[PDB]
């Protein structure tokens, strides 16, 4: 039986336009363990994105933190895209600086 990932997109620190920050993509609750995780600036794949090592929880599901450096602006859009066997098409979550 396969399990669908949940995703959160959010900064390490509270965003301030013009200030370097780290953007996180936190992916959890998924199974099987194989997963492809991209982050996008304004539609475009971000090249340097670091992945944590993969762990699983007591309920057997896997979780993993993807992240990248960024400097938030007022109008730049950021998202995280996850392709996973449990889902028909890739799943995308947009960053909301208020969340």
């Amino acid at each position: 039986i396969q399990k669908t990932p949940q995703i959160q997109v959010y900064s390490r620190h509270p965003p301030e336009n013009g200030k370097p920050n780290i953007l996180n993509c936190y992916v959890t609750q998924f199974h099987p363990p194989h997963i492809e995780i991209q982050m996008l600036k304004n539609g475009k794949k971000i090249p340097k994105v670091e992945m944590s090592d993969m762990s699983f929880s007591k309920d057997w599901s896997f979780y993993i933190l993807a992240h990248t450096e960024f400097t938030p602006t007022e109008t730049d859009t950021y998202a995280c895209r996850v392709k996973h066997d449990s889902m028909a098409e890739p799943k995308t979550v947009y960053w909301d600086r208020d969340m």
Binding site: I1, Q2, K3, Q6, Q8, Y10, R12, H13, P14, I22, N24, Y26, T28, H31, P32, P33, H34, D53, M54, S55, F56, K58, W60, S61, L65, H67, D98, M99
Partner: protein, 278 residues
């Protein structure tokens, strides 16, 4: 002091055609990774995941490494075995997981011993609380249940969980206790956001706290809201600390009626916060 745990989480993943199964052992002391073995490398070895384990000598590492490589290849067979039990293709990717360990009380004594298996994300078999008998989760598992009985492994594993497991857990806490006990208190603040018509949103943030265990509430004049308070799951900052928020939709102009509470183990007392308009 409270209780303590030593747990190992293990993952075996076949990827046929693409090479050998990816094997992974992660060890935790009190829900805190402290060792890892990752088969994806030219000379894989068991390795420290917390600096306090570097206190252990090359003898120890060698020995855990050799154990892990043994376990790896054994799980490789288990994968072929399981295809059999389940009448499955030799082409698909499959996953075996194991969680096993021991938790002890403040007195250093065994509170509980356990070991549970899962195939492709479903429960497979488990050593019952009585540390002597097995619960098979389906029919294929009954084959292992009977195999592990006809070989007395419910007694062999009973020695590990009560003996070496508990002992090493004591050796581990020994060197790691000062780091383990660490605590980072949450810093909290309330944000204000709009909403259609005469409603607004109040968001209580808690940042930079360790460990991740935390509780946030909202109060209308001293009384917790429950119903339609929104929140996100506790999530890592990426720097060792955690993050949570909780939010309420309140009436425009009635914001000073609302109070946010942050209960965390590092706090002298719960934080109490209000939306404050500068």
């Amino acid at each position: 002091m409270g209780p303590h745990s030593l747990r190992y989480f293990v993952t075996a993943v076949s990827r046929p055609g693409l090479g050998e199964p990816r094997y992974m052992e992660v060890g935790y002391v009190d829900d805190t990774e402290f060792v890892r073995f990752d088969s994806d490398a030219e000379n894989p070895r068991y390795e420290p995941r917390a600096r306090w384990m570097e206190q252990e000598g090359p003898e120890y590492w060698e020995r855990e490494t050799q154990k892990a490589k043994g376990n790896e290849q054994s799980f490789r067979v288990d994968l072929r075995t399981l295809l059999g039990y389940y009448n499955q293709s030799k082409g698909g990717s499959h996953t075996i997981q194991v969680i096993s360990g021991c938790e002890v009380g403040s007195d250093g004594r065994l509170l509980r011993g356990y070991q549970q298996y899962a195939y492709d994300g479903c429960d497979y078999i488990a050593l019952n609380e009585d540390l002597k008998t097995w619960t098979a989760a389906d029919m294929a598992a009954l084959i292992t249940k009977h195999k592990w009985e006809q070989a007395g492994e419910a007694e062999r594993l009973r020695a590990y969980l009560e003996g070496t497991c508990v002992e090493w857990l004591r050796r581990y806490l020994k060197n790691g206790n000062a780091t383990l006990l660490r605590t980072d208190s949450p810093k909290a603040h309330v944000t204000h956001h709009s909403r259609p018509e005469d409603k607004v949103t109040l968001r209580c943030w808690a940042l930079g706290f360790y460990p991740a265990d935390i509780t946030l509430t909202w109060q209308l004049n001293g009384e917790e809201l429950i119903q339609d308070m929104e929140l996100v799951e506790t999530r890592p900052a990426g720097d060792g600390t955690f993050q949570k928020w909780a939010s309420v939709v309140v009436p425009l102009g009635k914001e000073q009626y609302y109070t946010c509470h942050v209960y965390h183990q590092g706090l002298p007392e719960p934080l109490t916060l209000r939306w404050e308009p500068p």
